[PDB]
Amino acid sequence: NERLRALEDIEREIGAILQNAGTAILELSKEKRLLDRQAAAFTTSVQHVEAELSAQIRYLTQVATGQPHEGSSYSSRKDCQMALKRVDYARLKISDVARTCEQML
Amino acid sequence: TECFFLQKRLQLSVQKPDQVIKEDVSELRSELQRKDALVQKHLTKLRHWQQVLEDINVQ
């Protein structure tokens, strides 16, 4: 759950770091203010993105041997399907009884 | 007293069956009204339960 958001934020930060490095290079090579701080921030963000990528790659490696988490609660799915079918059949029978009663009265 | 009432019933039936016919008609009318009321109550309950199931089966 949180690892997905972490990887998404890491990718967004890598993109932002690339953009900041490009902008800092442009501002520094245009003419010769904040170019030094911009380059420092860009280098720091690039290093942080690299560290985050290395940490995510150095994960616990849950299985890496076969198809893990086999069985997605299919029994519960089938039970819920049968319950819904029972409810639908009950509704149909109740509607039939109601039509019979309306024809009676 | 019960036997006296039944003897009165015999003499009345042999002397005036129109009263018995009227009583039978009234009993049939009352039974019809009671059956109609029971059917209406059952229909109301069934419609309530149908709406309940329709609202509960949202899943």
Side-chain angles (χ1 to χ4, degrees), chain A residues 90-91 98, chain B residues 47 50 53:
Chain A
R91 180 185 307 195
Chain B
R47 279 184 176 83
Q50 172 180 337
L53 267 160

PDB file of all heavy atoms in Angstrom, chain A residues 87 90-91 94-95 97-98 101-102 104-105, chain B residues 39 43 46-47 50 53-58, unseen atoms left out:
ATOM      1  N   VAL A  87     -30.835 -14.078  -2.925  1.00  0.00           N
ATOM      2  CA  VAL A  87     -31.603 -12.848  -2.762  1.00  0.00           C
ATOM      3  C   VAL A  87     -32.421 -12.560  -4.015  1.00  0.00           C
ATOM      4  O   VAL A  87     -33.589 -12.159  -3.935  1.00  0.00           O
ATOM      5  CB  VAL A  87     -30.667 -11.675  -2.413  1.00  0.00           C
ATOM      6  N   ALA A  90     -35.364 -14.965  -4.198  1.00  0.00           N
ATOM      7  CA  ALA A  90     -36.369 -14.562  -3.223  1.00  0.00           C
ATOM      8  C   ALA A  90     -37.147 -13.352  -3.715  1.00  0.00           C
ATOM      9  O   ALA A  90     -38.371 -13.285  -3.555  1.00  0.00           O
ATOM     10  CB  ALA A  90     -35.709 -14.269  -1.877  1.00  0.00           C
ATOM     11  N   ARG A  91     -36.456 -12.388  -4.327  1.00  0.00           N
ATOM     12  CA  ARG A  91     -37.140 -11.216  -4.862  1.00  0.00           C
ATOM     13  C   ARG A  91     -38.098 -11.600  -5.981  1.00  0.00           C
ATOM     14  O   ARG A  91     -39.216 -11.079  -6.055  1.00  0.00           O
ATOM     15  CB  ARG A  91     -36.122 -10.192  -5.359  1.00  0.00           C
ATOM     16  CG  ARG A  91     -36.752  -8.941  -5.942  1.00  0.00           C
ATOM     17  CD  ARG A  91     -35.707  -8.018  -6.540  1.00  0.00           C
ATOM     18  NE  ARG A  91     -34.640  -7.713  -5.592  1.00  0.00           N
ATOM     19  CZ  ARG A  91     -33.762  -6.728  -5.750  1.00  0.00           C
ATOM     20  NH1 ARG A  91     -33.826  -5.946  -6.819  1.00  0.00           N
ATOM     21  NH2 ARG A  91     -32.823  -6.523  -4.839  1.00  0.00           N
ATOM     22  N   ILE A  94     -41.107 -13.292  -4.455  1.00  0.00           N
ATOM     23  CA  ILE A  94     -41.929 -12.314  -3.754  1.00  0.00           C
ATOM     24  C   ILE A  94     -42.716 -11.472  -4.747  1.00  0.00           C
ATOM     25  O   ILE A  94     -43.884 -11.148  -4.515  1.00  0.00           O
ATOM     26  CB  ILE A  94     -41.053 -11.441  -2.836  1.00  0.00           C
ATOM     27  N   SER A  95     -42.096 -11.113  -5.873  1.00  0.00           N
ATOM     28  CA  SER A  95     -42.811 -10.357  -6.894  1.00  0.00           C
ATOM     29  C   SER A  95     -43.928 -11.189  -7.511  1.00  0.00           C
ATOM     30  O   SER A  95     -45.010 -10.668  -7.806  1.00  0.00           O
ATOM     31  CB  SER A  95     -41.839  -9.879  -7.972  1.00  0.00           C
ATOM     32  N   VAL A  97     -45.599 -13.622  -5.955  1.00  0.00           N
ATOM     33  CA  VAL A  97     -46.652 -13.680  -4.947  1.00  0.00           C
ATOM     34  C   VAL A  97     -47.409 -12.361  -4.883  1.00  0.00           C
ATOM     35  O   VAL A  97     -48.632 -12.344  -4.699  1.00  0.00           O
ATOM     36  CB  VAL A  97     -46.059 -14.054  -3.576  1.00  0.00           C
ATOM     37  N   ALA A  98     -46.704 -11.239  -5.042  1.00  0.00           N
ATOM     38  CA  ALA A  98     -47.366  -9.940  -5.026  1.00  0.00           C
ATOM     39  C   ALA A  98     -48.282  -9.775  -6.230  1.00  0.00           C
ATOM     40  O   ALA A  98     -49.384  -9.230  -6.108  1.00  0.00           O
ATOM     41  CB  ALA A  98     -46.326  -8.822  -4.985  1.00  0.00           C
ATOM     42  N   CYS A 101     -51.354 -11.789  -5.510  1.00  0.00           N
ATOM     43  CA  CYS A 101     -52.217 -11.106  -4.553  1.00  0.00           C
ATOM     44  C   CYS A 101     -52.952  -9.941  -5.203  1.00  0.00           C
ATOM     45  O   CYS A 101     -54.139  -9.720  -4.934  1.00  0.00           O
ATOM     46  CB  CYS A 101     -51.397 -10.623  -3.358  1.00  0.00           C
ATOM     47  N   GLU A 102     -52.262  -9.184  -6.059  1.00  0.00           N
ATOM     48  CA  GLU A 102     -52.908  -8.073  -6.749  1.00  0.00           C
ATOM     49  C   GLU A 102     -53.997  -8.572  -7.688  1.00  0.00           C
ATOM     50  O   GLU A 102     -55.060  -7.951  -7.804  1.00  0.00           O
ATOM     51  CB  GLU A 102     -51.868  -7.257  -7.517  1.00  0.00           C
ATOM     52  N   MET A 104     -55.672 -11.209  -7.103  1.00  0.00           N
ATOM     53  CA  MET A 104     -56.735 -11.666  -6.213  1.00  0.00           C
ATOM     54  C   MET A 104     -57.635 -10.509  -5.797  1.00  0.00           C
ATOM     55  O   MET A 104     -58.854 -10.550  -5.997  1.00  0.00           O
ATOM     56  CB  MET A 104     -56.130 -12.353  -4.988  1.00  0.00           C
ATOM     57  N   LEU A 105     -57.050  -9.468  -5.216  1.00  0.00           N
ATOM     58  CA  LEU A 105     -57.815  -8.308  -4.774  1.00  0.00           C
ATOM     59  C   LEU A 105     -58.357  -7.523  -5.963  1.00  0.00           C
ATOM     60  O   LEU A 105     -59.498  -7.719  -6.381  1.00  0.00           O
ATOM     61  CB  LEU A 105     -56.954  -7.402  -3.892  1.00  0.00           C
TER      62      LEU A 105
ATOM     63  N   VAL B  39     -55.594 -10.752   3.173  1.00  0.00           N
ATOM     64  CA  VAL B  39     -54.850 -10.680   1.919  1.00  0.00           C
ATOM     65  C   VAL B  39     -54.193  -9.315   1.767  1.00  0.00           C
ATOM     66  O   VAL B  39     -53.046  -9.210   1.319  1.00  0.00           O
ATOM     67  CB  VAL B  39     -55.775 -10.999   0.731  1.00  0.00           C
ATOM     68  N   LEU B  43     -50.229  -8.612   1.513  1.00  0.00           N
ATOM     69  CA  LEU B  43     -49.664  -7.883   0.382  1.00  0.00           C
ATOM     70  C   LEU B  43     -48.826  -6.702   0.851  1.00  0.00           C
ATOM     71  O   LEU B  43     -47.757  -6.431   0.293  1.00  0.00           O
ATOM     72  CB  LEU B  43     -50.780  -7.413  -0.550  1.00  0.00           C
ATOM     73  N   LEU B  46     -45.588  -8.111   2.154  1.00  0.00           N
ATOM     74  CA  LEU B  46     -44.755  -8.589   1.058  1.00  0.00           C
ATOM     75  C   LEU B  46     -44.114  -7.434   0.304  1.00  0.00           C
ATOM     76  O   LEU B  46     -42.940  -7.509  -0.071  1.00  0.00           O
ATOM     77  CB  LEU B  46     -45.583  -9.456   0.112  1.00  0.00           C
ATOM     78  N   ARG B  47     -44.863  -6.352   0.073  1.00  0.00           N
ATOM     79  CA  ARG B  47     -44.289  -5.201  -0.615  1.00  0.00           C
ATOM     80  C   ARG B  47     -43.220  -4.529   0.236  1.00  0.00           C
ATOM     81  O   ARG B  47     -42.184  -4.093  -0.285  1.00  0.00           O
ATOM     82  CB  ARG B  47     -45.387  -4.207  -0.986  1.00  0.00           C
ATOM     83  CG  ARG B  47     -46.143  -4.577  -2.248  1.00  0.00           C
ATOM     84  CD  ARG B  47     -47.158  -3.511  -2.613  1.00  0.00           C
ATOM     85  NE  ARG B  47     -47.818  -3.804  -3.879  1.00  0.00           N
ATOM     86  CZ  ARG B  47     -48.860  -4.620  -4.007  1.00  0.00           C
ATOM     87  NH1 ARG B  47     -49.363  -5.227  -2.941  1.00  0.00           N
ATOM     88  NH2 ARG B  47     -49.398  -4.829  -5.200  1.00  0.00           N
ATOM     89  N   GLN B  50     -40.213  -6.648  -0.087  1.00  0.00           N
ATOM     90  CA  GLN B  50     -39.626  -6.488  -1.412  1.00  0.00           C
ATOM     91  C   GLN B  50     -38.786  -5.221  -1.483  1.00  0.00           C
ATOM     92  O   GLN B  50     -37.665  -5.231  -2.004  1.00  0.00           O
ATOM     93  CB  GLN B  50     -40.729  -6.465  -2.470  1.00  0.00           C
ATOM     94  CG  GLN B  50     -40.248  -6.100  -3.863  1.00  0.00           C
ATOM     95  CD  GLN B  50     -41.372  -6.082  -4.878  1.00  0.00           C
ATOM     96  OE1 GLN B  50     -42.410  -6.714  -4.683  1.00  0.00           O
ATOM     97  NE2 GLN B  50     -41.171  -5.353  -5.969  1.00  0.00           N
ATOM     98  N   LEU B  53     -35.575  -5.808   0.499  1.00  0.00           N
ATOM     99  CA  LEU B  53     -34.586  -6.584  -0.244  1.00  0.00           C
ATOM    100  C   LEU B  53     -33.964  -5.760  -1.363  1.00  0.00           C
ATOM    101  O   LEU B  53     -32.755  -5.852  -1.609  1.00  0.00           O
ATOM    102  CB  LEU B  53     -35.227  -7.853  -0.805  1.00  0.00           C
ATOM    103  CG  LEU B  53     -35.122  -9.099   0.072  1.00  0.00           C
ATOM    104  CD1 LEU B  53     -36.178 -10.118  -0.316  1.00  0.00           C
ATOM    105  CD2 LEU B  53     -33.731  -9.699  -0.036  1.00  0.00           C
ATOM    106  N   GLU B  54     -34.773  -4.952  -2.053  1.00  0.00           N
ATOM    107  CA  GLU B  54     -34.240  -4.111  -3.119  1.00  0.00           C
ATOM    108  C   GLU B  54     -33.251  -3.087  -2.579  1.00  0.00           C
ATOM    109  O   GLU B  54     -32.273  -2.752  -3.257  1.00  0.00           O
ATOM    110  CB  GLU B  54     -35.380  -3.410  -3.856  1.00  0.00           C
ATOM    111  N   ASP B  55     -33.483  -2.584  -1.366  1.00  0.00           N
ATOM    112  CA  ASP B  55     -32.555  -1.628  -0.776  1.00  0.00           C
ATOM    113  C   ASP B  55     -31.334  -2.311  -0.171  1.00  0.00           C
ATOM    114  O   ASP B  55     -30.267  -1.695  -0.084  1.00  0.00           O
ATOM    115  CB  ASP B  55     -33.267  -0.793   0.289  1.00  0.00           C
ATOM    116  N   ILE B  56     -31.467  -3.570   0.246  1.00  0.00           N
ATOM    117  CA  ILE B  56     -30.364  -4.263   0.902  1.00  0.00           C
ATOM    118  C   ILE B  56     -29.438  -4.981  -0.071  1.00  0.00           C
ATOM    119  O   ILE B  56     -28.275  -5.236   0.271  1.00  0.00           O
ATOM    120  CB  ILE B  56     -30.897  -5.270   1.937  1.00  0.00           C
ATOM    121  N   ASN B  57     -29.911  -5.314  -1.270  1.00  0.00           N
ATOM    122  CA  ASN B  57     -29.093  -6.036  -2.235  1.00  0.00           C
ATOM    123  C   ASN B  57     -28.165  -5.125  -3.030  1.00  0.00           C
ATOM    124  O   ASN B  57     -27.708  -5.521  -4.110  1.00  0.00           O
ATOM    125  CB  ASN B  57     -29.985  -6.831  -3.190  1.00  0.00           C
ATOM    126  N   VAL B  58     -27.878  -3.920  -2.531  1.00  0.00           N
ATOM    127  CA  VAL B  58     -26.979  -3.014  -3.240  1.00  0.00           C
ATOM    128  C   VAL B  58     -25.574  -3.594  -3.315  1.00  0.00           C
ATOM    129  O   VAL B  58     -24.811  -3.272  -4.235  1.00  0.00           O
ATOM    130  CB  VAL B  58     -26.979  -1.626  -2.571  1.00  0.00           C
TER     131      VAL B  58
END
